[PDB]
Design a binder for this molecule. Structure first.
Ligand code: CLA
Ligand code: CLA
Ligand code: CLA
Ligand code: CLA
Ligand code: CLA
Ligand code: CLA
Ligand code: CLA
Ligand SMILES: CCCCCCCCCCCCCCCC(=O)OC[C@H](COP(=O)(O)OC[C@@H](O)CO)OC(=O)CCCCCCCCCCCCCCC
Ligand SMILES: CCCCCCCCCCCCCCCCCC(=O)OC[C@H](COP(=O)(O)O)OC(=O)CCCCCCCCCCCCCCCCC
Ligand SMILES: CC1=C[C@H](O)CC(C)(C)[C@H]1/C=C/C(C)=C/C=C/C(C)=C/C=C/C=C(C)/C=C/C=C(C)/C=C/C1=C(C)C[C@H](O)CC1(C)C
Ligand SMILES: CC1=C(/C=C/C(C)=C/C=C/C(C)=C/C=C/C=C(C)/C=C/C=C(C)/C=C/C2=C(C)CCCC2(C)C)C(C)(C)CCC1
Lengths: 241, 86, 741, 221, 41
């Protein structure tokens, strides 16, 4: 097989440690379209032939985009309350302002000063997310709907575009950025790279929280204090204590 | 722990098959053995694996050789510990 | 080439229109039920997907979705068991006093005087005494709570819904293509590592973080209410360090390969825990971790999407020797394109696995307080024995089916299948001679013993006190196992099982496991087992080998796998099909497993199970096996008549249901004799007379009533025979072992 | 066409739930009224359920308001035993059989209207009990009965758009009252108090009085 | 639901439901009227 020669320098042009991790199977369909396309698919999950259900290139790309957006929100929400409590701007103890002690896992920690208990908040969150994600799902299934039925006048901004990951109407692109297609592609690459970094960061924050029982900002400060002693191998003895 | 005898055994037992893999001394994702299992076939590229390594030493080869090296080094270290050496 | 996921989007529509019309799957069932034979054939060919479609892709998709449905049924069953353990069981009471409280997980509604079946099991609870061993398994897992059993039942219901959704999804929305099913390299790479290896590793993790601390506290002696919950044992290493001090240093000695410091909870002693009579749970942890590592290593043998790994076809085709010609040429193609051959192989090894499970679980109990409850022990052994024998017979059946249908002589020239088919007469004749020799030198020894006892010549019969027949090889193997620790097992502090030798393990006044001595009667019964196994092998192998053709009938493959006969000619060709060979092998497997479980129950009621009195062991029957199991009158009297007094005097008690089933199964077994001995023509003519009676009163059904077909009659007879015999033995065993012990 | 129960999404059931029936928004995911005869039967059942639940919910609300006002009026979940205690001369089987018989008379009238839409407007009953039809295109019988007896104010005789508006009012209020009675039963099961009691308890204390605080819905908090 | 009701009208579903309702009726008869050896009026 030996790849296709001319399909490989496209991955070599984006530099970095790519091409070392791409394959001939991946480059059959990963031909430079879609943002973030660096040829990395060793398992062939986005092979268009025989693709159905959720193992499908447009569904997988959509899942990547909204996963990376949710992880950007999650990483910023992990690193904001602790960096505000460390500075003393908020009246929260930094051991309490840790993200997993905020009531998401009551065994891991509780915050009883919310205006409701977490189950009521989850009930209304379930209703609201059910609204939002089901309208998003039906717009994915029918990429022209959600603007034909009345929604207190909010349906005008739910037309979307051809790509389900990029509606960009009057609300989803209110400031109108990326006027010209190459700028839009560049900012899409910005978004996907930032979001995949944030996915790695969210996984790392979970692993550090299990590993050190402290916040990610606290772990960063302890690592910067003494990197030789405070690392993964140096914290391997005291992990859940 | 760094620089200990078991650390030296682990780094050697992980690094030596990695070196033997690239230079054709060990089986590779592109270089296999035939029915006999002694002689090594010439490098063949139907897997479609590419790398910036000039000899074609793929990341899959790195993972496989490091896996086997870790298995062998763990066996060696645990054998030397049980005998009373190390 | 290139292992990948390939599916078809929406192949089969989801609606109820084919539910209205039965028999839609096969063309031969069309145009309505003209006779009741149509009704019987509709159920007969429901799962015969080869007769439904000729496409291997559709057959594979149907098999996949049927597997999902079966998994959903098993999950519903598990949810029901956990729900009954939660709601209608004395599990918490049994946890406080496992030695005296009889396990129970099913209660009955007082309707017709059936509330007498609610036994006085103990713990202030009334219900049927269960023999399935769920209580011991849950105690081993470290439950010790009612709410957790209910949570597991709900989770199993959710998993059943997931299984059914997966089956519907993979038949109706995304059905995999044929080449997806043929990725046997990837399937083995994922079943070795991701299924078995990861499952063993995950169970080792659970046992480390849940089973070890809770069961350690239970063995030290603590009421389960004040035991810390599993999560807080898992949450911090502090309590774990109090119970197992190696957790104070955490994962540091693991990654530095100083694994010897984990020896407090990763142990290797052998024997049994004297508090419970089960295996050491640290030993089970070490076992599961070791086999998980081994299986994850085994999961990288085969080549998938990368150049490393060996292909199954290449390994097969290169194993050719001078005695066998081409060797394994064609085995890869007849196993990646025929489902029946894979079913035969998997059923054979699955039944052998079930039998091995039965053996290894009586020999050395893995769950706490499983040895002391003799009822669940005997029931578990017997159940796994019967499942193994059934699966083995099914393996023979599906090997015969593959030989009839999916065997192509073009791609099977001069290979092992061809070599075996070309000298089938030698194999069958030699197995016949072995069966006759074993039958003589096993049964005739018993008959000689009967004759000498009845002639008043006890010095002339084969026995330990007269003409000895000692199992010297088996006794020496026991000695080798008993002497293994400290010699050939230097790191073992005790032997694997007390059956090899040593001291009697007693828990709560009852013997957990004690050494088993082999004498003349054990020699005779082992040779009887060999004879029965050999005859069952003879019938199944003869059916498989002569399914294709024969000297008598050269075109048996044309007539199919399941046909009654080829007429009264050639002297008579009744039961020449491989199906009838399975039909006879079912009876022979029944005979074999029945003798095996009889030997098991008598041997351990006479030499293993019993009570301790600080001066000896008082067995259930009192050592009568060694002097009565060499005589058929001894089996009839000292085992089959002496132990039957518990089931026939069980009326008016909680074992009255066992007493009733003991007679109902006799009725079913003798009801089988109608179908087994009679023939279709008589019943057809009698049905003609009854049809005349119906015509006289205008009550004739439009669907013509026909006598059961010859294969139908044989199947009904063998089903009733095996059901009646197995249920008779089940009622006898359970009543006897729950009334005395 | 019309506003659906799930905006967008054109797999709405084939043209038996077209935009003709009152209250039609294409909501039949289980296909429980796929066949036309079952569809007509279920339209009758839905209209009857809506009217009955509306009457029941109005009665429950009024008796719960009167109970909070200090009147000698029991709550809805205990009115039967209160009536039997206040009136010991009434046999329970007596009242139950009388209810069965009287309800059965009018229910067999409605049933024979369902079987034959035009058969109940003659005989002993006058022509006003013929019915006016509506569902499935027919102009006789059905759940909608005109006349000067079941429409004595005549609010759906004249101005067809007024009739359509009032029918939409009736079907929406009936579905809302069915869900209201479901909520009444669930709140009684989870709290043990009346509907108005629950409403004023939640209005007095918005927080710590939701469904998670009763210990029955969430079974551990 | 025509095909679903036709499936419910099929012989095995109807005979299982019929023996279920008959057995349940007999069981509740014995629940409310137990130990009825004879038809004593
Ligand atoms: C156990 C048998 C089984 C098998 C062999 C398959 C096989 C397959 N499924 Mg499938 N599935 C199953 C069960 C199974 N499924 C069940 C029980 C459900 C219901 C939940 C589903 C629901 C399902 C959907 C909705 C889809 C598939 C699809 C597919 C196909 C591609 C999936 C893939 O490989 O990509 C990768 C698979 C994943 C990324 C999932 C991994 C993570 C999930 C959540 C499982 C994790 C459970 C894990 C074992 C638990 C470990 C412990 C953990 C809590 C830490 C593939 C042929 C896709 C298809 O349509 O075909 C193309 C598809 O969209 N399946
Ligand atoms: C740094 C991450 C990042 C980047 C580079 C992008 C980039 C893009 N997004 Mg995206 N998005 C992100 C994060 C990001 N997004 C996150 C975390 C979410 C989840 C909430 C979303 C959800 C989202 C949706 C739903 C949509 C987009 C769309 C777009 C495209 C429209 C052009 C644009 O306005 O750019 C964005 C410009 C920037 C990110 C730079 C500004 C950064 C400042 C500091 C943050 C502004 C926040 C501000 C203070 C709050 C008030 C806003 C305003 C009232 C002042 C563009 C390529 C639309 C689209 O696809 O068009 C077709 C669209 O439909 N995004
Ligand atoms: C060259 C350095 C070296 C040294 C000094 C040792 C020394 C030792 N090894 Mg070791 N080992 C090494 C390298 C070394 N090993 C390497 C490179 C590997 C591969 C990674 C292994 C893998 C290995 C395993 C898997 C095991 C050992 C074990 C042992 C100890 C006992 C060996 C024994 O008598 O087994 C026993 C001798 C027998 C004859 C028993 C064999 C009977 C089997 C079970 C029959 C089963 C049949 C089945 C089909 C196969 C011993 C102190 C054993 C141990 O764990 O230590 C306690 C052990 O299980 N080693
Ligand atoms: C690590 C990956 C993995 C795992 C864990 C499994 C696990 C399983 N497979 Mg599967 N399979 C895999 C990969 C995997 N497979 C691949 C890559 C292929 C393509 C070559 C297949 C093709 C295949 C076929 C054709 C069949 C199976 C079957 C089975 C089941 C065996 C029967 C049983 O009762 O076991 C024990 C039961 C359990 C352990 C219960 C746990 C069940 C959970 C849901 C397992 C989830 C694993 C799943 C792969 C996760 C992805 C699905 C996700 C979208 C939800 C079992 C659960 C057989 C079956 O029964 O069909 C369902 C069967 O017919 N597999
Ligand atoms: C993994 C297990 C497995 C699987 C998947 C199959 C699959 C298959 N078998 Mg098979 N078989 C198996 C194990 C298995 N078998 C075992 C263990 C045996 C030994 C008993 C057999 C013996 C066997 C024979 C002799 C035959 C098959 C046949 C078949 C094929 C058609 C089955 C059918 O639709 O007939 C209909 C299935 C039924 C009518 C189900 C009812 C069967 C009995 C009556 C159920 C037993 C009663 C049960 C215990 C409940 C008792 C309580 C009661 C009082 C209520 C099919 C592909 C047939 C074939 O032609 O192959 C192509 C064939 O004749 N099998
Ligand atoms: C215990 C063994 C047994 C039993 C019960 C029977 C029973 C019967 N034989 Mg038979 N027979 C037997 C052995 C047996 N035979 C043997 C070994 C032979 C030699 C081959 C014969 C040869 C023979 C011949 C030649 C004839 C009979 C006939 C009959 C029927 C006679 C009518 C009658 O008496 O009604 C009694 C009914 C019963 C005993 C059946 C039991 C009642 C059932 C259990 C009730 C159903 C409840 C429940 C739904 C069961 C299903 C459970 C399931 C759904 C889970 C009858 C059904 C004659 C016949 O056909 O009559 C017209 C006939 O001509 N028999
Ligand atoms: C028992 C009362 C009842 C009945 C008979 C109907 C009947 C009907 N409805 Mg309606 N509906 C109801 C209540 C009812 N509805 C309520 C309370 C609401 C508000 C949530 C709605 C909202 C609604 C909408 C938006 C629409 C309909 C529509 C329809 C029509 C087509 C649907 C169909 O054929 O399925 C038949 C329905 C049933 C057979 C009753 C379902 C009962 C199930 C089997 C029980 C489970 C549901 C229950 C809530 C679960 C909890 C029970 C228990 C645990 C407490 C049909 C004539 C569609 C239409 O075209 O209007 C004409 C449509 O657009 N309904
Ligand atoms: C978690 C278990 C395994 C996960 C496998 C499944 C995940 C698949 C992800 C694979 C990578 C995908 C492609 C990567 C391809 C890739 O890497 O992209 C290249 C990456 C950035 O590339 P860009 O996207 O910026 O490319 C644009 C530029 O190249 C322009 O020329 O550069 C890096 O190498 C960053 C990574 C350095 C990481 C520094 C961490 C150092 C810690 C070392 C720890 C090991 C030793 C520890 C000893 C104590
Ligand atoms: C209880 C289920 C009984 C449903 C009644 C029969 C369904 C008929 C129907 O929906 O029309 C078929 C209908 C096709 O229309 P057709 O032209 O009548 O065949 O299929 C559908 O579109 C919806 C099918 C949904 C069936 C639900 C199955 C149960 C879901 C439970 C989830 C857990
Ligand atoms: C590429 C590829 C291809 C080939 O072929 C194959 C393979 C290898 C498979 C691959 C790879 C893959 C991967 C790497 C994956 C991963 C992912 C991730 C990590 C995600 C995350 C992701 C993540 C995410 C979303 C996250 C999110 C988060 C969140 C929301 C959070 C939230 C929160 C906050 C704020 C805080 C508070 O206090 C709490 C809470 C509430 C909790
Ligand atoms: C010279 C050169 C270089 C270098 C490179 C390198 C050096 C690389 C590497 C790397 C490495 C150094 C790697 C490693 C590896 C390994 C692995 C990745 C593995 C694995 C795994 C496994 C398989 C394990 C297993 C286990 C467990 C799990 C636990 C217990 C024990 C055992 C063993 C069993 C550069 C480019 C810079 C520059 C130029 C040239």
């Amino acid at each position: 097989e030996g790849a296709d020669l001319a399909k490989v320098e496209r991955v070599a042009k984006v530099g970095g440690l790519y091409k070392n991790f791409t394959s001939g199977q991946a480059l059959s369909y990963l031909d430079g379209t879609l943002p973030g396309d660096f040829g990395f698919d060793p398992l062939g999950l986005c092979d268009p032939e025989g693709a159905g259900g959720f193992i499908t290139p447009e569904w997988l790309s959509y899942s990547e985009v909204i996963h990376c957006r949710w992880a950007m929100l999650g990483a910023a929400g992990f690193l904001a309350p602790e960096i505000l409590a460390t500075a003393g701007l908020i009246p929260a103890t930094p051991e309490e302002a840790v993200w997993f002690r905020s009531g998401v896992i009551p065994p891991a920690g509780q915050y009883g000063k919310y205006w409701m208990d977490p189950y009521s908040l989850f009930w209304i969150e379930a209703i609201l997310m059910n609204f939002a994600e089901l309208k998003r799902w039906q717009d994915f299934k029918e990429p022209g709907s959600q603007s034909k039925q009345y929604f207190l006048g909010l349906e005008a901004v739910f037309g979307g575009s051809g790509n389900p990951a990029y509606p960009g109407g009057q609300w989803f692109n209110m400031l109108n950025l990326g006027k010209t297609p190459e700028e839009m592609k560049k900012l899409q690459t910005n978004e996907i790279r930032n979001g995949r970094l944030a996915m790695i960061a969210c996984l790392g924050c979970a692993a550090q929280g299990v590993m050190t029982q402290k916040g990610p900002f606290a772990n960063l400060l302890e690592h910067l204090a003494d990197p030789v002693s405070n690392n993964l191998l140096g914290n391997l003895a005291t992990i859940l204590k | 722990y760094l620089g200990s005898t078991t650390n030296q055994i682990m780094v050697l037992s992980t690094f030596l098959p990695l070196v033997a893999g690239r230079f054709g001394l060990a089986p590779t994702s592109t270089r296999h053995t035939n029915q006999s299992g002694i002689k090594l076939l010439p490098a063949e590229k139907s897997a479609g694996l590419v790398s910036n390594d000039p000899a074609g030493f793929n990341a899959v080869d790195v993972l496989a050789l490091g896996a086997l090296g870790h298995i062998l080094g763990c066996g060696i270290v645990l054998g030397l510990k049980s005998t009373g050496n190390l | 080439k290139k292992v990948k996921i390939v599916v078809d989007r929406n192949p089969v529509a989801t609606n109820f229109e084919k539910w209205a019309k039965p028999g839609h799957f096969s063309r031969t069932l069309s145009k309505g039920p003209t006779t009741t034979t149509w009704i019987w054939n509709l159920h007969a060919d429901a799962h015969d997907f080869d007769t439904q479609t000729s496409d291997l892709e559709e057959i594979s998709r149907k098999v996949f979705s049927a597997h999902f449905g079966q998994l959903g049924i098993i999950f519903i069953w598990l949810s029901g068991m956990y729900f009954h353990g939660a709601r209608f069981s004395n599990y918490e009471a049994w946890l406080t006093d496992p030695t005296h409280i009889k396990p129970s997980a099913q209660v009955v509604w007082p309707i017709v005087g059936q509330e007498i079946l609610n036994a006085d099991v103990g713990g202030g609870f009334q219900g049927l005494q269960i023999t399935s061993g769920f209580f011991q398994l849950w105690r081993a897992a470290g439950i010790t709570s009612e709410l957790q059993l209910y949570t597991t039942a709900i989770g199993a219901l959710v998993m059943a819904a997931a299984m059914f959704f997966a089956g519907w999804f993979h038949y109706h929305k995304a059905a995999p293509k044929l080449e997806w099913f043929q990725n046997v390299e990837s399937m083995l790479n994922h079943h070795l590592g991701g299924l078995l290896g990861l499952g063993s590793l995950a169970w080792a993790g659970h046992q480390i973080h849940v089973s070890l601390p809770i069961n350690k506290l239970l063995d030290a002696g603590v009421d389960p209410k004040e035991i810390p919950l599993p999560h807080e044992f898992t949450l911090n290493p502090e309590l774990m360090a109090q119970l197992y001090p190696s957790f104070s240093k955490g994962l540091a000695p693991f990654f530095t390969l100083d694994w010897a410091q984990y020896s407090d909870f990763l142990t290797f002693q052998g024997g049994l825990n004297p508090v419970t009579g089960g295996l050491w749970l640290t030993d089970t942890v070490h076992h599961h971790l070791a086999i998980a590592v081994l299986f994850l290593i085994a999961g990288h043998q085969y080549r998938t999407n990368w150049g490393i790994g060996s292909s199954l076809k290449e390994i097969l085709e290169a194993h050719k020797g001078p005695f066998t010609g081409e060797g394994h040429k064609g085995l890869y193609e007849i196993l990646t394109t025929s489902w029946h051959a894979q079913l035969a192989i998997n059923l054979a090894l699955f039944g052998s696995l079930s039998i091995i499970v039965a053996h290894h679980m009586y020999a050395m109990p893995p769950y706490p307080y499983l040895a002391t409850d003799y009822g669940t022990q005997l029931s578990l052994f017997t159940h796994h024995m019967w499942i193994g024998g059934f699966c083995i017979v099914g393996a023979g059946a599906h090997a015969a089916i593959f030989m009839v249908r999916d065997y192509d002589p073009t791609n099977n020239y001069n290979n092992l299948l061809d070599r075996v088919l070309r000298h089938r007469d030698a194999i069958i004749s030699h197995l016949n001679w072995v069966c006759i020799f074993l039958g003589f030198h096993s049964f005739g020894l018993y008959i000689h013993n009967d004759t000498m006892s009845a002639l008043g010549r006890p010095q002339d019969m084969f026995s330990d006190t007269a003409i000895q027949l000692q199992p010297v090889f088996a006794q020496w193997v026991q000695n080798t196992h008993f002497l293994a620790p400290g010699f050939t097992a230097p790191n073992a502090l005790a032997s694997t099982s007390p059956s090899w030798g040593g001291d009697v393990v007693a828990v709560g006044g009852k013997v957990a496991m004690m050494p088993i001595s082999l004498g003349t009667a054990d020699f005779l019964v082992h040779h009887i087992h060999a004879f029965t196994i050999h005859v069952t092998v003879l019938i199944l192998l003869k059916g498989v080998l002569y399914a294709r053709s024969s000297r008598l009938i050269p075109d048996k493959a044309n007539l199919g796998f399941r046909f009654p006969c080829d007429g009264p000619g050639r002297g008579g060709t009744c039961q020449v099909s491989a199906w009838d060979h399975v039909f006879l092998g079912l009876f022979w497997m029944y005979n074999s497993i029945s003798i095996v479980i009889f030997h098991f129950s008598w041997k351990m009621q006479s030499d293993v199970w019993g009570t301790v009195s600080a001066n000896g062991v008082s067995h259930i029957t009192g050592g009568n096996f060694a002097q009565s199991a060499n005589t058929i009158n001894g089996w009839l009297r000292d085992f089959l008549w002496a132990q039957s007094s518990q089931v026939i005097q069980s009326y008016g008690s909680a074992l009255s249901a066992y007493g009733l089933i003991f007679l109902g199964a006799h009725f079913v077994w003798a009801f089988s004799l109608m179908f087994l001995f009679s023939g279709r023509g008589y019943w057809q003519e009698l049905i003609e007379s009854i049809v005349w009676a119906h015509n006289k009163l205008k009550v004739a059904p439009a669907i013509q009533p026909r006598a059961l077909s010859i294969t139908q009659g044989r199947a009904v007879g063998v089903a009733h025979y095996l059901l009646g015999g197995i249920a008779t033995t089940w009622s006898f065993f359970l009543a006897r072992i729950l009334a005395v012990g | 066409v019309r506003e659906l129960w799930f905006p967008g999404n054109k797999e709405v059931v084939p043209d038996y739930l077209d935009g003709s029936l009152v209250g039609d928004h294409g909501f039949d995911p289980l296909g429980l009224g796929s066949s036309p005869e079952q569809l007509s039967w279920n339209v009758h059942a839905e209209i009857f359920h809506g009217r009955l639940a509306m009457t029941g919910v109005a009665g429950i609300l009024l008796t719960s308001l009167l109970h909070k006002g200090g009147a000698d009026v029991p709550e809805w979940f205990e009115a039967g035993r209160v009536y039997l205690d206040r009136n010991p001369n009434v046999d329970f089987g007596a009242l139950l059989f009388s209810t069965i018989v009287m309800s059965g008379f009018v229910e067999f009238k409605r049933l024979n209207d369902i079987r034959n839409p035009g058969s109940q407007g003659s005989g002993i009953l006058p022509e006003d009990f013929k019915g006016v039809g509506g569902p499935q295109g027919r102009t006789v019988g059905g759940p909608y009965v005109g006349g000067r007896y079941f429409d004595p104010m005549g609010l759906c005789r004249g101005s067809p758009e007024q009739t359509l508006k009032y029918k939409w009012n009736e079907i929406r209020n009936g579905r809302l009252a069915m869900m209201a009675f479901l909520g009444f039963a669930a709140q009684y099961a989870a709290t043990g108090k009346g509907p108005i009691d629950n409403l004023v308890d939640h209005v007095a204390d918005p927080f710590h009085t939701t469904f998670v605080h009763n210990g029955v819905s969430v079974p551990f908090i | 639901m025509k095909d679903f009701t036709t499936y419910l009208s099929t012989a095995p579903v109807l005979t299982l439901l019929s023996v279920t309702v008959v057995a349940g009726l007999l069981i509740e008869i014995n629940r409310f009227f137990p130990d009825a050896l004879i038809a004593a009026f």
